[PDB]
Every structure is written in C-alpha cells, then in structure tokens.
Amino acid sequence: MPTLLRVYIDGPHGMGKTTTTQLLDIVYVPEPMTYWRVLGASETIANIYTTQHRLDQGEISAGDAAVVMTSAQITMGMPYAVTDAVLAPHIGGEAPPALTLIFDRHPIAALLCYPAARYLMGSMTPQAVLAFVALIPPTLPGTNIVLGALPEDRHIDRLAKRQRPGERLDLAMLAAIRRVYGLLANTVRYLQCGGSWREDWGQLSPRPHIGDTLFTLFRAPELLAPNGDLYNVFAWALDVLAKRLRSMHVFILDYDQSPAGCRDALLQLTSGMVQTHVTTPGSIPTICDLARTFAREMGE
Amino acid sequence: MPTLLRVYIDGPHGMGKTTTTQLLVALDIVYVPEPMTYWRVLGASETIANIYTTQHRLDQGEISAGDAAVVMTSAQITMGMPYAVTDAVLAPHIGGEAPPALTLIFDRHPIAALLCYPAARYLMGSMTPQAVLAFVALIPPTLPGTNIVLGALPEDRHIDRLAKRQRPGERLDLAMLAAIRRVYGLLANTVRYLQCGGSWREDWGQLAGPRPHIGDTLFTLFRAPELLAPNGDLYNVFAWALDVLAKRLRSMHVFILDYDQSPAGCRDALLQLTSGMVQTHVTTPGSIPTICDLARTFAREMGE
Ligand SMILES: Nc1nc2c(ncn2COCCO)c(=O)[nH]1
Ligand SMILES: Nc1nc2c(ncn2COCCO)c(=O)[nH]1
Structure with a gap:
C-alpha cells in the first residue's frame, strides 16, 4: 500500500507556525478557527483570555475560572x-x-x-x-x-x-506555554533514553533530570495523599503520559529566521521523519478529502 | 494462554447494579467499584452534589444555560x-x-x-x-x-x-431519570441497529430482534440546529463525530438484565448471562496478577 508522511507543526503560539506552514501531493490541515469562533461555541479564544484576565484581576475565584x-x-x-x-x-x-x-x-x-x-x-x-x-x-x-x-x-x-x-497579550501565559513545551521536549528525550518516572520520583525531593521533564508539574499537593504519596489514579495517568510521549518523533525548528528560511528549514526536517503505509488502497484520496473538507469548513 | 472475561454493568442509576455485582463476586473474580472517593474527594469536592445542585439552580432559573453547561x-x-x-x-x-x-x-x-x-x-x-x-x-x-x-x-x-x-448530594430529579432511562434505551438500539448493518449516513434522511429505526437510535439526538449548516446538513466535524460513535458501539456485546426481582434473582440472572459472554486472551503471562492488583488497588483507593 502507498506511503504517508504526517507532520504536526506544534509549539507555543506566536512563533509564526501557521504563517510558515502555508509557505510550504501535500495537503495542509489548518487551524480550526471557525470551530473556535462559531461552530463549537461562540468566540472560545476570547472566552479563554477574558477569564484569565478576570482571574488575574481578582474579579472571580480560582474555582470559577477553572470551571x-x-x-x-x-x-x-x-x-x-x-x-x-x-x-x-x-x-x-x-x-x-x-x-x-x-x-x-x-x-x-x-x-x-x-x-x-x-x-x-x-x-x-x-x-x-x-x-x-x-x-x-x-x-x-x-x-x-x-x-x-x-x-x-x-x-x-x-x-x-x-x-x-479575542486574544490578549499575556506575557505570563507566553512564559507558561514556553516552559511546558520546553519541558515536553525534555520528557520525550528522558523517556526515549530510558527514564522511569517512578524510579526517579524521589529526586523531586545521559538523560534529562526528571526535574526538567513534565513529571515535575505533577508533584502537586492536590494529587498527593497525607503522607506525601501520589494517589494511584494520578500515578496511572502519568504512566499513560509516559507511554504516549515516548513513541513520538520530535523535531525542532528555529523560527529565528525569515519566513523563507523557516519554510526551507521545515522541508529540510522532513528527511528523518517517519513515514507509514496506509491501510487500504483508497486511503490517500480519503485522507485528502478529509484534509480539504476540514480546511474548507474550519479554516477561517 | 490464560483467558479473561470482562463485564461492565451499566445503565440508569438506582436499579441495583452495585448490589448485584457485589453479590456476584461473593460467589479469581474482582470487582472494580464505583470510584465514589474520586468523585467526593480526590478529583474534586462532592461532584455528585455539584451536578445535582447545578441542574437544580438551572431548573429554578437561578443561573443561565451557559453557566450550568460550563x-x-x-x-x-x-x-x-x-x-x-x-x-x-x-x-x-x-x-x-x-x-x-x-x-x-x-x-x-x-x-x-x-x-x-x-x-x-x-x-x-x-x-x-x-x-x-x-x-x-x-x-x-x-x-x-x-x-x-x-x-x-x-x-x-x-x-x-x-x-x-x-x-x-443527589436530588430526586425524575426528569433526569426519564432522560437517562431514555438515553440507555437508545444506546441498546444503537448497538443492534449497527450490528444489523445500519448506516446512519444512509438513513439520516429518515429522521437480538429486528434492525431498529434510526429515530430509535442515539443518532436521533444529534438533529440539533446548532449542529446544522445553512443547507440543512450536519457540519462535517459533527458528522465525523457520529462516525466515531458508530465505530465504538458496533463492536460492543450488549446484554439486558432484568432488575425487577430480588437481589438474589438479579445475581443469578446475571450469572446466567455470563456463561455465554465473550472472553479474550491476555497478552503477557503476568497480565492476570497485574490486572488483579490494578482492580484491587483501584477498589482500595477509590471505592466508597
Ligand atoms: N488549546 C488552547 N489554546 C490556547 C489557550 N490559550 C491560548 N491558546 C492559544 O491558542 C490560540 C492563540 O492564542 C488555551 O487555554 N487552550
Ligand atoms: N457520570 C455521571 N454520573 C451521573 C451523573 N448524574 C448522575 N450520575 C450517576 O448518579 C450519581 C451516582 O453514580 C452525571 O452527570 N454524570
């Protein structure tokens, strides 16, 4: 059966992602802006940023904002x-x-x-x-x-x-998202190099130190028992995170360049990405129309 | 290789599902209970109470639809x-x-x-x-x-x-009881509809035993105006969601237990449905004990 190469462009917002992807037998599944603004709900991005600002200002509680x-x-x-x-x-x-x-x-x-x-x-x-x-x-x-x-x-x-x-320039959010994505990349390397979060969990008290991976965010008091122990439910969700991340293939794109270079760079990063076979002979056309239909309906 | 038999007892609340399952286990059979401790403490504070008070405030007109939904x-x-x-x-x-x-x-x-x-x-x-x-x-x-x-x-x-x-934290809401009895009734029909060859896409315009009418399936609840494009059809994102629904329910093996009897009746009736249920092999030699510990740990921590 033919081969497919899927590439997910991800990372903190505001780096020029969409912009450079458009610059590139190659379909683009775009940002579902129409779903966010109208289909799934009314102006979700605006809803997200107003609530944080209301929290930041103390107009509402952490519980109201969380819900x-x-x-x-x-x-x-x-x-x-x-x-x-x-x-x-x-x-x-x-x-x-x-x-x-x-x-x-x-x-x-x-x-x-x-x-x-x-x-x-x-x-x-x-x-x-x-x-x-x-x-x-x-x-x-x-x-x-x-x-x-x-x-x-x-x-x-x-x-x-x-x-x-509806967005608001939140420097604190920019810092939060940069840390998460930075931690995410470390986690993948940690996991791929053999890291066992259960074996290094004590350390929170050639691979990245668990303190530099996403597992550090979950040594959170709400998740811990009176004796400091992580409840199994929560520990089980960490076993899934670990499983899901370890098989992903991560690639880094330096956006600190001109739109032509970024675009060039991404094409360059394609050579070591992993391709797969499709399931049926009719998969490509089916995949194509899914991409174009999604694009047509949710891209704004 | 060793086999495993998994059985999920589901349906509207207040029928006696938790009692009869325990009775069943009282007879290498582990029960994975309702995780009430997660709902009352570990995940949030009194979640069941939050849900019922909320639908109540909504019903009384104290909060808005947007407030309740969030x-x-x-x-x-x-x-x-x-x-x-x-x-x-x-x-x-x-x-x-x-x-x-x-x-x-x-x-x-x-x-x-x-x-x-x-x-x-x-x-x-x-x-x-x-x-x-x-x-x-x-x-x-x-x-x-x-x-x-x-x-x-x-x-x-x-x-x-x-x-x-x-x-x-629960409140006597008969309207919610009707809705949930109705939803599970649709679930049952949806599984046979799909197992009898039904295709929601083929029968959309129409909105053991014989194949049910799509109008008697879960698909019928998604004929909502919010989900519909200006031309009368469903937005593709929502159609694709129904494709997933049909894919998930079509391979499930559904059985109906009559709860209109004594607890010991229900238990024996359930024990009979069980002899003809689908088993599976486990993947590794140590999956069984591992699985035992998981259910036991789940029970110990979340049961209540
Ligand atoms: N998924 C998601 N995206 C967000 C959130 N806040 C900001 N973004 C960025 O997505 C769109 C650009 O702001 C959030 O809370 N969730
Ligand atoms: N998951 C779930 N269970 C509910 C809800 N309302 C009632 N129940 C079940 O009754 C509470 C005891 O199980 C609800 O919204 N969600």
Whole structure:
C-alpha cells in the first residue's frame, strides 16, 4: 500500500507556525478557527483570555475560572480529536511519500500542553489536567511533531504582530506555554533514553533530570495523599503520559529566521521523519478529502 | 494462554447494579467499584452534589444555560476520569478474543461518562450537543471482549427505588431519570441497529430482534440546529463525530438484565448471562496478577 508522511507543526503560539506552514501531493490541515469562533461555541479564544484576565484581576475565584477554563479546552481540542479518530484506521505500519499531511497542531496541544499551562497560571486544577492526559489517543506510527525555537524577546515581538481574535497579550501565559513545551521536549528525550518516572520520583525531593521533564508539574499537593504519596489514579495517568510521549518523533525548528528560511528549514526536517503505509488502497484520496473538507469548513 | 472475561454493568442509576455485582463476586473474580472517593474527594469536592445542585439552580432559573453547561462539562470530566485511566492502563493487556482464568466485573464502562450522562444532561438543557460530541470523539477504542450489561426496570418501580437509594448530594430529579432511562434505551438500539448493518449516513434522511429505526437510535439526538449548516446538513466535524460513535458501539456485546426481582434473582440472572459472554486472551503471562492488583488497588483507593 502507498506511503504517508504526517507532520504536526506544534509549539507555543506566536512563533509564526501557521504563517510558515502555508509557505510550504501535500495537503495542509489548518487551524480550526471557525470551530473556535462559531461552530463549537461562540468566540472560545476570547472566552479563554477574558477569564484569565478576570482571574488575574481578582474579579472571580480560582474555582470559577477553572470551571470556565476547563470547559473551554474541550471546545479547543475537538477538531484535533475527531481528525485523529477518523484517520487512525487508515494509518499502517512504519515504512517519496504518496501524500504528505501537514497539520496545524497535534492533539496533545489541547489535551496536555495548554491545560498544563493554564494549571501553571492558576486557572486549571491539576486533576483536570491529568483527566485530559488519560484521554490522549494512542500514539500511532509515524507521529512526527515539529516544535519551535525562538529567543523569548523575538517571540514577544512575533507574538505581538500576529494575535488571534479575542486574544490578549499575556506575557505570563507566553512564559507558561514556553516552559511546558520546553519541558515536553525534555520528557520525550528522558523517556526515549530510558527514564522511569517512578524510579526517579524521589529526586523531586545521559538523560534529562526528571526535574526538567513534565513529571515535575505533577508533584502537586492536590494529587498527593497525607503522607506525601501520589494517589494511584494520578500515578496511572502519568504512566499513560509516559507511554504516549515516548513513541513520538520530535523535531525542532528555529523560527529565528525569515519566513523563507523557516519554510526551507521545515522541508529540510522532513528527511528523518517517519513515514507509514496506509491501510487500504483508497486511503490517500480519503485522507485528502478529509484534509480539504476540514480546511474548507474550519479554516477561517 | 490464560483467558479473561470482562463485564461492565451499566445503565440508569438506582436499579441495583452495585448490589448485584457485589453479590456476584461473593460467589479469581474482582470487582472494580464505583470510584465514589474520586468523585467526593480526590478529583474534586462532592461532584455528585455539584451536578445535582447545578441542574437544580438551572431548573429554578437561578443561573443561565451557559453557566450550568460550563459547570456540568467540567463535572463530567471529573466523573469519567477513573474510568478512562483504568481503560488506558488495562488496554495493552487484552489480547484477541477467545473457564476464564480471571473475571473482572466493572461498575460502569467509560461510555457512561463519555456519552450517556452527557447526552442526558444535554436533554436536560445543562449541556450543549457540541460538548457531548467532543466527549464522544474522545471515547477510547473498544477493546475486544467488551461485554456490557444494561438493565431493565419499570419506571414506577424505578421511581420508588430512587426515593431512598440516593447518592450523597443527589436530588430526586425524575426528569433526569426519564432522560437517562431514555438515553440507555437508545444506546441498546444503537448497538443492534449497527450490528444489523445500519448506516446512519444512509438513513439520516429518515429522521437480538429486528434492525431498529434510526429515530430509535442515539443518532436521533444529534438533529440539533446548532449542529446544522445553512443547507440543512450536519457540519462535517459533527458528522465525523457520529462516525466515531458508530465505530465504538458496533463492536460492543450488549446484554439486558432484568432488575425487577430480588437481589438474589438479579445475581443469578446475571450469572446466567455470563456463561455465554465473550472472553479474550491476555497478552503477557503476568497480565492476570497485574490486572488483579490494578482492580484491587483501584477498589482500595477509590471505592466508597
Ligand atoms: N488549546 C488552547 N489554546 C490556547 C489557550 N490559550 C491560548 N491558546 C492559544 O491558542 C490560540 C492563540 O492564542 C488555551 O487555554 N487552550
Ligand atoms: N457520570 C455521571 N454520573 C451521573 C451523573 N448524574 C448522575 N450520575 C450517576 O448518579 C450519581 C451516582 O453514580 C452525571 O452527570 N454524570
């Protein structure tokens, strides 16, 4: 059966992702802006940023904000979830690809990364975060995630030039999301190099130190028993996080360059990405129309 | 290789599901109980109480639809968390389909939290169909050997059974009882509809035993204007969500238990449904004891 190469462009917002992907037998599954603004709900991004500002200002409590913020992440990740679910049966075993599928973000952005960042912002409970983690779909073969690199100051500038509708320039959020994504990359290397979070959990009291991986965010008091022990439910969600992340293939793109270079660089990063066979002979056309239909309906 | 038999006892609350399952285990059979401790303490504070007070405020007109939905949605996330991790952890142990070397009786299946209760709250007006379909899109892949037991119990009998057997924080909401009895009835029909060859896409315009009418399936709840494009058809994102729903429920083995009898009757009736249920092989030699510890640890920590 033919081959497919899927590439998920992910990372903190404001780095020029969408911009450089458009610059690239190659379909682009875009940012579901229409779902966020109208289909799933009314102006979700605006809802997300207003609630944080209301929390920041003390107009509401951490509990009010958490309920709003949590409900919102479900709307944000919906498009990525159905896409993964409908595509899964078409993906075959690891293997020029017959089709290159470029995505604007992977499910973990909405089921792990942002909820994690909102936790670090005090608007999401750590239990809500691990509930999204437990729902992360199984990691299929050939899951190539391209994350971005950009010095913080150039990122602030870029973030500033292109914002989304209803968004507010939150430097604290930019810092939170940068840490999460930075931790995420370390976690993948940790896991791939043999790291056992259960074996190094004490350390929170040639691989990255567990203190530099995402597991550090969950040594949170809400998740711990009176004797300091992590409750098994929560420990079980960490075993799933570990399983889901270890098989992903991470690639880093230096966005600290001109749009032509970034675009060049991404093409360059394609050579070591993993391709897979498809399941049926009719998979490519089916995959194509899914991409174009999604694009047509949810890209704004 | 050793075999395993998993059985999920599900259905509307207040029928006597938890009692009869325990009775069943009292007879290498572990019970994975209702994780009440996660709902009352570990995941949030008195979640069942939050849910019922919220639908109540909504019903009384003290909060708005948007307020209730935001609360209901986060609360549904806490409710299903214990089901989801157990499924994810247990998944690599289940092998292909196949007495059992181990029998696992679960108190509810992940779809109770990821489909049925959300669908009912939608009917009750405290949740949006977009949110229900998002949950559905997150329903974990159905493992082979998924035997699910749903229950039957006359409404008058059901009503009287509720006016006592209330959870802590629960309120006597007969409207929600009707909605949930209705949703599980649709669930049952949806499984046979799909197993009889039904295709929701083919029968959309129409909106053991013979193949049911789509209007008697879960698909009928998603004929909501919020989900419809200007041309009358469903937005593709929502259509794809129904594709997932059909894929998840079509491989489940559903059985109906009659709860209109004494507890010992229900137990024996359930014990009979069990002899003809689908088993599976486990993947590794140590999956069985591992699985034993998991259910026991789950029970010890979350039961209440
Ligand atoms: N998924 C998700 N994306 C977010 C959130 N806050 C900001 N973003 C960025 O996505 C769009 C640009 O702001 C959030 O809470 N969740
Ligand atoms: N998951 C879930 N269970 C509920 C809900 N309402 C009632 N129950 C079940 O009754 C509470 C005791 O199980 C709800 O919204 N979600």
